[PDB]
Ligand binder design. Structure first.
Ligand SMILES: *[C@@H]1O[C@H](CO)[C@@H](O[C@@H]2O[C@H](CO)[C@@H](OC3O[C@H](CO[C@H]4O[C@H](CO)[C@@H](O)[C@H](O)[C@@H]4O)[C@@H](O)[C@H](O[C@H]4O[C@H](CO)[C@@H](O)[C@H](O)[C@@H]4O)[C@@H]3O)[C@H](O)[C@H]2NC(C)=O)[C@H](O)[C@H]1NC(C)=O
Ligand SMILES: *[C@@H]1O[C@H](CO)[C@@H](O)[C@H](O)[C@H]1NC(C)=O
Ligand SMILES: *[C@@H]1O[C@H](CO)[C@@H](O)[C@H](O)[C@H]1NC(C)=O
Ligand SMILES: *[C@@H]1O[C@H](CO)[C@@H](O)[C@H](O)[C@H]1NC(C)=O
Lengths: 389, 146, 49
């Protein structure tokens, strides 16, 4: 049998194909081979490429893909186009998958979508647990985009329930204009800084901090991004800087490293950047999340034997005939992929339960020291070595 | 339109533009306002907004105007009021999370001047202000920005 | 007390080792200190003489 998946990806308008497009195509290819899941049904994919940060083009391409008819739609990265695609999908009953965090609005009554990105309430609680473990008193949070203030709600509200003092600063629009911000930070004698930005902005900030003399053994940095292990820490290994972060890519498993090594060929087809300070041949967590998203959709549609894809029209609000049983099957799925175990929460499609590796920068390199869970809290094995019994 | 439906607002906007209008007075929501703004910027019709919405910085639409006062200037006015009243420890109680976008300058002001912020959020039920007021009373805090 | 090439290598190692901050001093006996590229060190606040 055939099965079609809708894919919308904001393309580069340049030579190479962008991130998550290669992940989606590679994952669709690797599900068709190794015939353990879906033994009698193949997967086809339709890919539309839209402009950056536009929602009407995304709406038109989603209407075209639903006119062709797909089982599910893998939405884009920008929040506004994701909102438009989610409104269309919840109107027409097609399930929607999101791989990037967007601002969830409270009065929205949609129920035909899930998101595999870890929710920043849980991530902010993990960051707060790490801060409480490190016995800090004065923390400076530096945020890049204004929506990150939504992403750090629990960290902002945490001075009400503790003695922690909090100073919040915003990066400028220019990437290389971090020098007056770092000058103001070292003039105010702040040494416990939480950076909330992308990994590329983190690399630029680290280059600016090394140029500004901020990177000694006296300082400490916590990065909210999950791609800290993809950074280049070679010019910062011997300086003694206490860098700490979270990793979701379970690289200890043989299967995850094997899939990463398979993906590294197509990653090496894409050219790297010399001044970016990023190690090539590494899976971005967005690509791994797209991989795990199509695998959890695959194990959801394993349970359905009546996968009849029907063409739908955007001029009528006639709902799809099977979508409720699908949305139950995605929301009741238990699959382990590259990002550990995927377990969707009830009452909202977003993901709350996961496993994180607390990594830190030793003199050897980036090393895993802790394990975080929403129920178990913080393990922190090197603090668990003292066992007086 | 219904409550917070971007697709329904997009369908009504397409119907009104098939009828043909000079300009579109947008809704008071946020996501449907964004969809209507993108439609009007694509088709070149002016779009007049009334309520404030969160604006993405990377968006490059030029066919919309807003008539609510921008919350950067409002936040600067509240900082001028606070600096006039000469307060030390203030307590901001916000209802919706987008109001944290609305109070950027006041949140960033402890980096500039001497201030202390206690930031609290109203719960999801509108009648449950009593535990938050109890926590306000136990905190002994007497300059609340609502 | 070394050549300017050894001075450049030592300054690169000291930037990598995190010893380049406002809390240090450096005096070079070489006469080619003006030939050095002090662009990646001048914002760190070191006192090179
Ligand atoms: C699905 O999604 C919903 C919506 O988010 C989840 O409900 C939330 O689940 C969270 C985690 O289970 C809850 O988090 C915490 O709050 C605990 C105390 O809050 C208590 O008191 C307040 C009043 O102040 C009440 O309103 C609460 O109901 C609760 O009684 C706190 O103990 C928890 O602790 C962790 O973090 C702290 C540090 O922050 C550590 O000290 C702890 O050891 C824990 O590590 C959480 O902070 C949250 O209250 C729930 N509700 C809401 C509205 O967000 C639901 O759990 C999800 N379903 C899953 C995961 O299966
Ligand atoms: C930085 O890491 C080293 C690891 O040996 C540790 O000994 C030191 O205490 C840490 N510094 C801070 C400020 O946490
Ligand atoms: C912490 O991890 C160790 C092994 O890494 C395990 O033996 C222990 O049970 C864990 N403790 C908790 C509370 O999770
Ligand atoms: C280093 O040079 C600066 C010039 O900006 C000067 O102010 C300072 O006194 C000098 N000495 C030390 C120990 O920092």
């Amino acid at each position: 049998h055939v099965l079609r998946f809708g894919g919308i990806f904001e393309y580069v308008e340049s030579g190479p194909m962008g991130a998550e497009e290669l992940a989606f195509r590679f994952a669709v290819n690797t599900i068709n081979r190794n015939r353990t899941l879906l033994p009698n049904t193949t997967l086809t994919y339709d890919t539309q490429k839209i402009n950056l940060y536009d929602s009407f083009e995304a709406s038109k391409k989603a209407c075209d893909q639903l006119s062709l008819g797909v089982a599910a739609i893998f939405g884009p990265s920008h929040s506004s186009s994701a909102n438009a695609v989610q409104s269309i999908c919840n109107a027409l009953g097609v399930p929607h998958i999101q791989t990037r965090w967007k601002h969830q609005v409270s009065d929205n009554k949609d129920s035909f979508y899930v998101s595999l990105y870890p929710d920043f309430s849980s991530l902010s609680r993990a960051i707060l647990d790490l801060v409480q473990f490190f016995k800090w008193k004065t923390v400076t949070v530096v945020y890049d985009d204004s929506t990150g203030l939504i992403r750090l709600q629990e960290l902002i509200k945490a001075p009400s329930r503790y003695n922690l003092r909090l100073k919040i600063r915003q990066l400028p629009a220019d990437t290389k204009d971090a020098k007056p911000l770092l000058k103001e930070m070292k003039r105010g004698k702040e040494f416990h800084v939480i950076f909330d930005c992308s990994h590329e902005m983190a690399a630029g900030i680290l280059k600016q901090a090394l140029a500004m003399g901020m990177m000694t053994e006296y300082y400490h940095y916590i990065f909210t991004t999950l791609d800290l292990f993809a950074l280049d820490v070679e010019p910062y290994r011997y300086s003694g800087v206490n860098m700490t972060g979270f990793r979701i890519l379970n690289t200890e498993n043989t299967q995850v490293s094997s899939i990463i090594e398979k993906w590294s060929m197509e990653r090496l087809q894409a050219p790297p950047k010399p001044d970016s300070g990023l190690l090539d041949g590494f899976m971005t967590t967005d690509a791994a999340l797209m991989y795990d998203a199509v695998h959890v959709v695959s194990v959801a549609v394993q349970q359905f034997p009546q996968m009849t894809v029907s063409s739908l029209q955007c001029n009528r609000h006639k709902p799809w005939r099977f979508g409720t049983r699908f949305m139950s099957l995605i929301k009741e799925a238990h699959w382990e992929g590259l990002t550990g175990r995927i377990t969707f929460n009830k009452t909202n499609g977003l993901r709350t339960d996961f496993d994180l590796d607390v990594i830190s920068l030793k003199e050897e390199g980036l090393e895993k020291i802790g394990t975080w869970d929403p129920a178990s809290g913080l393990n922190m094995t090197e603090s668990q070595k003292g066992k007086p019994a």
